[PDB]
Enzyme design. Structure first.
Site, PDB file in Angstrom:
ATOM      1  CE1 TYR C  60      69.600  32.367  36.523  1.00  0.00           C
ATOM      2  CE2 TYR C  60      68.788  31.968  39.052  1.00  0.00           C
ATOM      3  CZ  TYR C  60      69.961  32.451  37.918  1.00  0.00           C
ATOM      4  OH  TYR C  60      71.061  33.067  38.377  1.00  0.00           O
ATOM      5  CD  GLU C  62      70.866  30.739  33.153  1.00  0.00           C
ATOM      6  OE1 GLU C  62      71.294  29.604  32.453  1.00  0.00           O
ATOM      7  OE2 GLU C  62      71.689  31.484  33.572  1.00  0.00           O
ATOM      8  CG  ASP C 216      74.695  53.824  23.247  1.00  0.00           C
ATOM      9  OD1 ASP C 216      73.524  53.685  23.731  1.00  0.00           O
ATOM     10  OD2 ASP C 216      75.624  53.688  24.198  1.00  0.00           O
ATOM     11  CB  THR C 242      69.787  52.925  28.855  1.00  0.00           C
ATOM     12  OG1 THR C 242      69.610  54.081  28.360  1.00  0.00           O
ATOM     13  CG2 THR C 242      71.103  52.680  29.022  1.00  0.00           C
ATOM     14  CE  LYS C 245      71.645  56.989  29.990  1.00  0.00           C
ATOM     15  NZ  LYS C 245      71.583  55.493  29.896  1.00  0.00           N
ATOM     16  NE  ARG C 251      69.016  53.800  37.183  1.00  0.00           N
ATOM     17  CZ  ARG C 251      69.386  54.841  36.894  1.00  0.00           C
ATOM     18  NH1 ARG C 251      70.517  54.570  36.104  1.00  0.00           N
ATOM     19  NH2 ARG C 251      69.082  56.074  37.348  1.00  0.00           N
TER      20      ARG C 251
HETATM   21  N1  LIG Z   1      76.594  22.353  36.037  1.00  0.00           N
HETATM   22  C1  LIG Z   1      75.931  23.729  35.673  1.00  0.00           C
HETATM   23  N2  LIG Z   1      74.435  23.366  35.442  1.00  0.00           N
HETATM   24  C2  LIG Z   1      73.572  24.613  35.094  1.00  0.00           C
HETATM   25  C3  LIG Z   1      74.201  25.840  34.822  1.00  0.00           C
HETATM   26  C4  LIG Z   1      75.851  25.983  34.781  1.00  0.00           C
HETATM   27  O1  LIG Z   1      76.363  26.929  34.510  1.00  0.00           O
HETATM   28  N3  LIG Z   1      76.493  24.903  35.501  1.00  0.00           N
HETATM   29  N4  LIG Z   1      73.422  26.897  34.489  1.00  0.00           N
HETATM   30  C5  LIG Z   1      73.706  28.190  34.651  1.00  0.00           C
HETATM   31  O2  LIG Z   1      73.156  29.172  34.209  1.00  0.00           O
HETATM   32  C6  LIG Z   1      72.002  26.519  33.842  1.00  0.00           C
HETATM   33  C7  LIG Z   1      72.261  25.715  32.390  1.00  0.00           C
HETATM   34  N5  LIG Z   1      73.082  26.643  31.420  1.00  0.00           N
HETATM   35  C8  LIG Z   1      73.491  26.372  30.246  1.00  0.00           C
HETATM   36  C9  LIG Z   1      73.701  27.056  29.036  1.00  0.00           C
HETATM   37  C10 LIG Z   1      74.173  26.780  28.002  1.00  0.00           C
HETATM   38  C11 LIG Z   1      74.804  25.504  27.742  1.00  0.00           C
HETATM   39  C12 LIG Z   1      75.315  25.015  26.551  1.00  0.00           C
HETATM   40  O3  LIG Z   1      76.045  24.157  26.503  1.00  0.00           O
HETATM   41  N6  LIG Z   1      74.877  25.734  25.407  1.00  0.00           N
HETATM   42  C13 LIG Z   1      75.472  25.337  23.866  1.00  0.00           C
HETATM   43  C14 LIG Z   1      74.622  24.093  23.598  1.00  0.00           C
HETATM   44  C15 LIG Z   1      73.245  24.559  23.134  1.00  0.00           C
HETATM   45  C16 LIG Z   1      72.296  23.398  22.204  1.00  0.00           C
HETATM   46  O4  LIG Z   1      72.780  22.228  22.435  1.00  0.00           O
HETATM   47  O5  LIG Z   1      71.076  23.690  21.800  1.00  0.00           O
HETATM   48  C17 LIG Z   1      75.149  26.584  23.060  1.00  0.00           C
HETATM   49  O6  LIG Z   1      74.442  27.596  23.509  1.00  0.00           O
HETATM   50  O7  LIG Z   1      75.659  26.594  21.911  1.00  0.00           O
HETATM   51  C18 LIG Z   1      74.836  24.668  28.993  1.00  0.00           C
HETATM   52  C19 LIG Z   1      74.390  25.043  30.299  1.00  0.00           C
HETATM   53  C20 LIG Z   1      71.572  25.649  34.437  1.00  0.00           C
HETATM   54  N7  LIG Z   1      72.281  24.398  35.091  1.00  0.00           N
HETATM   55  C1  LIG Z   2      77.636  29.169  40.807  1.00  0.00           C
HETATM   56  C2  LIG Z   2      76.931  30.516  39.911  1.00  0.00           C
HETATM   57  N1  LIG Z   2      77.646  31.738  39.672  1.00  0.00           N
HETATM   58  C3  LIG Z   2      76.943  32.504  38.942  1.00  0.00           C
HETATM   59  C4  LIG Z   2      75.831  32.459  38.550  1.00  0.00           C
HETATM   60  C5  LIG Z   2      75.380  33.741  37.822  1.00  0.00           C
HETATM   61  O1  LIG Z   2      74.250  34.278  38.356  1.00  0.00           O
HETATM   62  P1  LIG Z   2      73.263  35.262  37.177  1.00  0.00           P
HETATM   63  O2  LIG Z   2      72.448  33.898  36.615  1.00  0.00           O
HETATM   64  O3  LIG Z   2      72.537  35.953  38.067  1.00  0.00           O
HETATM   65  O4  LIG Z   2      74.226  35.868  36.364  1.00  0.00           O
HETATM   66  C6  LIG Z   2      75.179  31.354  38.647  1.00  0.00           C
HETATM   67  C7  LIG Z   2      73.700  31.052  38.094  1.00  0.00           C
HETATM   68  N2  LIG Z   2      73.283  29.532  37.998  1.00  0.00           N
HETATM   69  C8  LIG Z   2      71.970  29.509  37.835  1.00  0.00           C
HETATM   70  C9  LIG Z   2      71.870  28.230  37.884  1.00  0.00           C
HETATM   71  O5  LIG Z   2      72.522  27.386  38.531  1.00  0.00           O
HETATM   72  O6  LIG Z   2      70.592  27.705  37.464  1.00  0.00           O
HETATM   73  C10 LIG Z   2      75.787  30.176  39.475  1.00  0.00           C
HETATM   74  O7  LIG Z   2      75.193  29.015  39.742  1.00  0.00           O
HETATM   75  C1  LIG Z   3      75.065  56.832  25.352  1.00  0.00           C
HETATM   76  C2  LIG Z   3      75.329  55.792  26.577  1.00  0.00           C
HETATM   77  N1  LIG Z   3      75.154  54.490  26.619  1.00  0.00           N
HETATM   78  C3  LIG Z   3      75.182  53.783  27.650  1.00  0.00           C
HETATM   79  C4  LIG Z   3      74.962  54.205  28.764  1.00  0.00           C
HETATM   80  C5  LIG Z   3      75.046  53.281  29.948  1.00  0.00           C
HETATM   81  O1  LIG Z   3      73.969  52.959  30.505  1.00  0.00           O
HETATM   82  P1  LIG Z   3      73.944  52.150  32.059  1.00  0.00           P
HETATM   83  O2  LIG Z   3      74.519  53.184  32.909  1.00  0.00           O
HETATM   84  O3  LIG Z   3      72.781  51.632  32.093  1.00  0.00           O
HETATM   85  O4  LIG Z   3      75.256  51.095  31.803  1.00  0.00           O
HETATM   86  C6  LIG Z   3      75.108  55.549  29.043  1.00  0.00           C
HETATM   87  C7  LIG Z   3      74.933  55.957  30.200  1.00  0.00           C
HETATM   88  N2  LIG Z   3      75.265  57.299  30.471  1.00  0.00           N
HETATM   89  C8  LIG Z   3      74.914  57.772  31.800  1.00  0.00           C
HETATM   90  C9  LIG Z   3      75.105  59.398  31.724  1.00  0.00           C
HETATM   91  O5  LIG Z   3      75.206  59.861  30.471  1.00  0.00           O
HETATM   92  O6  LIG Z   3      75.252  59.869  32.713  1.00  0.00           O
HETATM   93  C10 LIG Z   3      74.977  56.320  28.080  1.00  0.00           C
HETATM   94  O7  LIG Z   3      74.999  57.699  28.119  1.00  0.00           O
END
Ligand SMILES: Nc1nc2c(c(=O)[nH]1)N(C=O)[C@@H](CNc1ccc(C(=O)N[C@@H](CCC(=O)O)C(=O)O)cc1)CN2
Ligand SMILES: Cc1ncc(COP(=O)(O)O)c(CNCC(=O)O)c1O
Ligand SMILES: Cc1ncc(COP(=O)(O)O)c(CNCC(=O)O)c1O
Ligand SMILES: Nc1nc2c(c(=O)[nH]1)N(C=O)[C@@H](CNc1ccc(C(=O)N[C@@H](CCC(=O)O)C(=O)O)cc1)CN2
Ligand SMILES: Cc1ncc(COP(=O)(O)O)c(CNCC(=O)O)c1O
Ligand SMILES: Cc1ncc(COP(=O)(O)O)c(CNCC(=O)O)c1O
Lengths: 472, 469, 468, 472
Positions: C60, C62, C216, C242, C245, C251
């Site tokens: 992770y 982010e 694009d 992308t 291609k 991907r």
């Molecule tokens: N309860 C909880 N914990 C978690 C997540 C969540 O979604 N919920 N996350 C899920 O991934 C991670 C944290 N993700 C976060 C991302 C952005 C901000 C946020 O408030 N960003 C503001 C402020 C940035 C700053 O102060 O510099 C911003 O981007 O402007 C908070 C949490 C890990 N822990």
């Molecule tokens: C409850 C929940 N749902 C969706 C996501 C999104 O998954 P993707 O990052 O793959 O988009 C998270 C990720 N949370 C990461 C964390 O808690 O640190 C999550 O905690």
């Molecule tokens: C111009 C263009 N932009 C974006 C995408 C999206 O890529 P993803 O499938 O990864 O989301 C495609 C996909 N085009 C697939 C095709 O032309 O057969 C595309 O042709």
């Protein structure tokens, strides 16, 4: 061949359109021969009516005085400028600190224009929930989630509520909701809330969440002008109003807005000034409205001059005293008034303890020439068969009634509600069955006769009872 | 103490408010003493004005007749019902096929409520571009992308235009744009277009792209009632209008909508019916408006009875004949009219072959008591034309020869604007130096007042007016 | 009792999941034994695949390098930094003038994030109409007003079209539409357009109407990197792509954006600088995405190093030459190509003159292991087929082999016409001609004998489970 | 000249790109020589990784199995159908009552696609507030009203909160808010909530306000599969999840949705059926995504087979047991854990009572090869310096660690936070000053050495430690 101008264009209504003339004459008699208690109604002056019915209706005057789209506005400009200056004077506002737009066609137009000026589509608003006493245009949707007002369609509404037991605004829950929901605009003022407003607390909440604060003083604007209720201008960024309720004017709306330097605030730049004027004007025109209704603006100018008089302050004092006296009379009998009284021009009467809905009371009252409106109360759900009835003092106070007369109105209302209950007990709660009790009801006839005799004792503004077609 | 009812409440305006009374009397004089050519203005009848200024203003009557939110509406309901029935009659509509809501406060409220009834926020609309003659409420944003009308804020508008060389609506480009943009609603009718509308073609386009079709007949409603222009009701789903322009009534709006069985459409079920009525009513109230303005509704009922008379049909014919005669006089002087003439109550004058902006001509005319308005013309901001209308002065009894005289007053006014421009330059700051103590302006103004003041005036008695000179 | 780590966690796929392993082996065979002509497909390298299937999937990360929401990113940060720097290098971009976000999960995420960064909901967008060669994500709604792409749901789109005579973008009509509709964003680039783009004219239009200009370049990104087609970076504010291609990587998606001083414009202050970087980054994360897919980012860094090589430039040149040679072969058989040729990696074959829908040809080709895709053509059931050169060029095919592909396509279409003439036009009726058809069987066998000869990147044919 | 296929296309990463190879090898050593406590992280199997890095990446397969746009999908269809069927089996779902879409690229795409399927733009949603434990994609905007997640831009969010004193979801305030706000969708499940969910009560609230109910089980999906926490499927309309957290698969998402007849409900027609399948598929493609990532879908199919094994159920039990043992150890040191314990895979550690921000603890831990993340806790406001740290058990439980090992992890964390305090006492709380204390800190070096010696005692899935470039 065209008709001569004198024939189609100068002949009086009574000859041109006897049918409409007769209906107006019947309506004139209705207004002065019953007890008119709709809280949003008043009887405006003949002077206002003469301005309303005038050649001012013929003029297109889009724009602002001095900055018009058409020519020919030399006098329309002076009328609108007089209306605006008199509006500021009526509410004791310094023109350096407040401006006003007097073109809104009515109250709902005024609010929608104010919202359009300061909000983008879908921006968040919080107003008093309709069943807590707020207006349709304060973001009304039903407890079932049905969006009713366009102010809940084009904007995102989260209403705040009164306390379910005391009927007073729950300021703590207001603050908590505002901090969670983060509205761009908080609206105060209402249609059926019988108490005054803590504008200072609304300002504190608006500052804590970064919202603009708008008061819609439509109902109590006449009391505000007379300095008989709290002034929203001390604390609100924008104040909207109608002019036909307690203000006793034509049907129109006004939007007041702050101008000049903003009060000091953390993070806010030095010398920051309010920027509402141009946005509010633009929202009214060209965004939402077309040509101003200059006859309404002229009539409003008259009403605002009349509102600034010593006699009008006395009227406003009398309105409040009459409402209190009526409330005390009803509560002595055991009737349930929301908050147990009033600090303004109205009382809101909960009929649910009697097992009655407001439509039945409104209907029976109407047959007795007692004019009320059924009204939603906290927690009910049917608009056309709601749990309450709303009673207001402005209209009959304008006919010169005083406290003892409002006590007689209280007795008439007690008789009407008692008779409503007796008919329901005998004929049934189903409206179809209840209605059968309204035919040849000697007690209804007796009450109607008593109401008309009482109503005929008082003078009546806006037309000469002595010249009306349908006399006693 | 309270003032006695008689003092504040029955005393005439002249005594209660001399300042406002005087200004109304000055405005009455101004209406008498000029040539009123704003195409959206008229002079309504005293009978309409008596209903407008009446105790009907005191009543709350939210809802519909027989289903109100307030008591006391026994007579207000009869007035509104009569207004609605006379509205259908005035437009020759079968009440089983058409209904009408007469509560809109004015034209712009009528349009916004009609849109709200049938569209969700951000749904797509097409209307005639403002510079092609459409109205603000038909979805006006500028050619700079500046959203001006609330129609373009709460909905997504894309205007259609006239042909840039003929001045007529380009129906092929309308169709192509509609098929590309796929509006939910196409609006026809306009504010400054001088020709009639091919509603049949608009219906073909609406059917081809799947849109509702609404006509805003505000400007020509009186001519429609008199059956002097094409009827939009033959082909449109909804017709909005004001009531104060060529219809000669109070300032108000109406929304007409289809009712009853729908015409055959492929894929649409059998026995299908229109479903506009409840949505239209709901949009007007409680969605957008509050209490109806019953004095306007009463005054409107009067105007609608007046509009259904043989005298009003003759009036509408005369409006058209006066507009043609004025356009012919101006074109005889070599001026340019958009589309080279008119089929309605107005002419759109192209000042481009002359070198003058509309505001120059409009401002000069205003000083001479000739009220026109500058008006965008096709492909213009800074309007290149002026719009001139016949309804108001026709209501004062003027006929073709008098409108030829109006033509000469306009020919004199533009000639003066030119002579000022040649002497003082085209820059407005420099041009404005010609409007100062210009004896020719003063002379034209005097000739205008002397011509105008002789004609009859509806709505009030000149014999009773405070300012007769 | 927990399984030992080695049993569940270290044992190869072939033992843990024979079912999935077998299907992957069958798919590897299928990619070897057919003529892959889908213009958006390629065969990436084993090196990219080794990075893609790696422990980078466990992390992770982010945020941005050096500014993460989680600890432990000492090496993930170096991988992402390297990926971003190699992305700028592959497209010959000055890092003071351009930045790139390499976190988008794919092309559609990249585009939607780019839009979210610079537009508010319901703001106006113009892109090439899907039937003119544009992509779904550039806007797409139906004649009935049904909003198909999320781009048309959350924003307001209006497409521009090609000219019906030439099949090229009609630039005057684009300009007129943009001046009428006033989009906030104009998108160029497409999915089935066989010609290059006049980015200079797009920039003139965008300036005239006050719009941002985004390209694009997903389909032609490999050709852009090799400098074999016009560079959108010369004129566009933002370039999305992308990476799988013609770029021949994993991907993933990338969003490039201008940085630094803006060029002179009337009514624009002095020392004005671009302000896309923070908005773009914020849109990707935290607005839209969650954790980056670091195995994709690592694999992308590999592909970007591979794309910057002289071998890749030669590859891009060969892709274009193969598409031309194929278009010339088909056009010598009398067939109709949209615009009459190609300037890129694909040709768009107009089948309407033959009386065939693209779906018939695509379905028959599929039964012969020729993979194309039915494709809308201007003025349309899609009436064309889109055919692309990248995938088979990656297997080492040159012009003469693409002429052979042209003959296989010629045979496939002749057979499609013969089935139609015998069983009828309705796909219900037409499908009867596909059953036990010895001519399809013969074409399928000839295709396999032709395809299985050539080399295959990404895996060793000598190791694969299915060699027949 | 084009490079031969063998040169560019078959040569191993170690030769084609030594820099990236070296970085992957350093990352591999980092993963198996530290203590990895990010609650959303896991160590997936080599079998998953072999499917992830495979020729499946080369295939465009837009559409659904059987209903594709391109050809060539004979095997990709079998892989996707097998992935979907295994997903239903992993969560003990009957294919007649539940369907699943396995194309979402990750968790955030899965959630946005689910929302797009069932909501129009600006429709209302209610999820657990981020500071109360919910995810960004559950409608996150800040206490200052700044819209952060696109789920608060394209939809209208009103978060519900935990009780400020106990840290548990305030179900009463959830119900009250839902009846006022009237959401179309209520979201349950979270990112940092250490307790299980009363899905029954969520269903009761959703039914009372007519909302759809969606559970995002991303964090606990592996525990759900093993029937070690409450199953959201019993009560939710839609269940979304990632696959890379406790489920131990590749990075991807899935959207589960009800199919078939709807349970009886007043006002609902007879024979009414669920209508989610087509809308959910269509939202994923063509509305939002392009080509599926078939290598992720194949890898996910492997992971889902692994998740249905008896070993995986024991793993899920051990994850919970390790989290509890860790929590008991930290609390026995007097540390403050939100809700005072855990019922899942994580503990949420409130550092405010120590006077520490989570970035400091995260930063010092990182220098010691202890990987955590700073985490918002109820009432704080800074995202990059928040009031807590979050510790999860899945990743090290996958390396074979049990309760006694997790008590040693608690001791390392105790040492690390103690050391963080000492540096703050010496150097101050300002970050530039605190950072000076991290240079040449002997106790950091000693703790890092101890962590590495401890971490090296355990096996490691996904790659052979014996084969890795960077050895002990
Ligand atoms: N309860 C909880 N914990 C978690 C997540 C969540 O979604 N919920 N996350 C899920 O991934 C991670 C944290 N993700 C976060 C991302 C952005 C901000 C946020 O408030 N960003 C503001 C402020 C940035 C700053 O102060 O510099 C911003 O981007 O402007 C908070 C949490 C890990 N822990
Ligand atoms: C409850 C929940 N749902 C969706 C996501 C999104 O998954 P993707 O990052 O793959 O988009 C998270 C990720 N949370 C990461 C964390 O808690 O640190 C999550 O905690
Ligand atoms: C111009 C263009 N932009 C974006 C995408 C999206 O890529 P993803 O499938 O990864 O989301 C495609 C996909 N085009 C697939 C095709 O032309 O057969 C595309 O042709
Ligand atoms: N507190 C308060 N009292 C008030 C008003 C107000 O705005 N607020 N009004 C301000 O004018 C009047 C009430 N106007 C109303 C108009 C419509 C609905 C409403 O909910 N209509 C639904 C239900 C219709 C039905 O049940 O038949 C609807 O139209 O669908 C309620 C009140 C008078 N009393
Ligand atoms: C076609 C049209 N529709 C609606 C309106 C609006 O009416 P209100 O001003 O009552 O809102 C106008 C006004 N047009 C005035 C003019 O053309 O001068 C109009 O021309
Ligand atoms: C507080 C308030 N604000 C605005 C309005 C709207 O005014 P118009 O009806 O002119 O749109 C009302 C009307 N209230 C009417 C009633 O309470 O009976 C109102 O009560």
């Amino acid at each position: 061949h065209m008709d001569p101008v004198s024939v189609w264009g100068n002949t009086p209504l009574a000859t041109v359109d006897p049918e409409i003339h007769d209906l107006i004459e019947k309506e004139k008699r209705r207004q002065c021969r019953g007890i008119e208690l709709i809280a949003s109604e008043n009887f405006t002056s003949f002077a206002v009516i003469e301005a309303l019915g005038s050649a001012l209706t013929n003029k297109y005057s889009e724009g602002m005085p001095g900055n018009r789209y058409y020519g020919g506005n030399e006098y329309i400009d002076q009328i609108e400028n007089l209306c605006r200056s008199r509006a500021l004077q009526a509410f004791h506002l310094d023109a350096q600190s407040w401006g006003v737009n007097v073109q809104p066609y009515s109250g709902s137009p005024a609010n929608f224009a104010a919202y359009t000026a300061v909000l983008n589509p879908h921006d968040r608003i919080m107003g008093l929930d309709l069943r807590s006493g707020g207006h349709l245009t304060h973001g009304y949707y039903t407890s079932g989630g049905k969006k009713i007002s366009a102010t809940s369609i084009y904007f995102e509404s989260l209403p705040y509520k009164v306390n379910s037991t005391t009927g007073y605004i729950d300021y703590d829950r207001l603050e908590e909701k505002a901090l969670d929901f983060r509205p761009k605009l908080i609206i105060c003022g209402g249609s059926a809330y019988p108490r005054d407003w803590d504008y200072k607390r609304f300002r504190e909440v608006a500052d804590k969440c970064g919202a603009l604060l708008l008061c819609d003083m439509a109902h109590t604007s006449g009391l505000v002008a007379a300095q008989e209720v709290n002034s929203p201008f001390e604390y609100c960024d924008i104040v909207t109003t109608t002019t036909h309720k307690s203000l006793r004017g034509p049907r129109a709306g006004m939007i007041f807005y702050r101008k000049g330097p903003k009060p000091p605030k953390k993070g806010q730049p030095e010398n920051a000034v309010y920027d509402f004027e141009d946005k509010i004007n633009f929202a009214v025109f060209p965004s939402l409205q077309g040509g101003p209704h200059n006859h309404q603006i002229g009539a409003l100018a008259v009403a605002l001059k009349q509102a600034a008089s010593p006699g009008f302050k006395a009227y406003a004092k009398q309105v409040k005293a009459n409402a209190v006296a009526l409330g005390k009379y009803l509560m002595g009998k055991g009737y349930s008034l929301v908050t147990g009284g009033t600090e303004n021009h109205l009382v809101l009467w909960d009929l649910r303890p009697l097992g009655l809905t407001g439509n039945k009371v409104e209907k029976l009252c109407d047959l007795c020439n007692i004019t009320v409106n059924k009204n939603a109360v906290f927690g009910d759900s049917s608009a056309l068969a709601p749990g309450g009835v709303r009673i207001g003092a402005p209209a009959m106070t304008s006919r010169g009634l005083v406290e003892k007369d409002f006590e007689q109105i209280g007795e008439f209302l007690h008789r009407a509600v008692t008779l409503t209950l007796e008919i329901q007990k005998e004929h049934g709660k189903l409206l179809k069955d209840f209605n059968k009790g309204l035919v040849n009801n000697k007690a209804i006839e007796d009450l109607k006769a008593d109401v008309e005799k009482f109503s005929a004792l008082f003078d009546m503004p806006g037309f000469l009872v002595s010249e009306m077609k349908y006399k006693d």
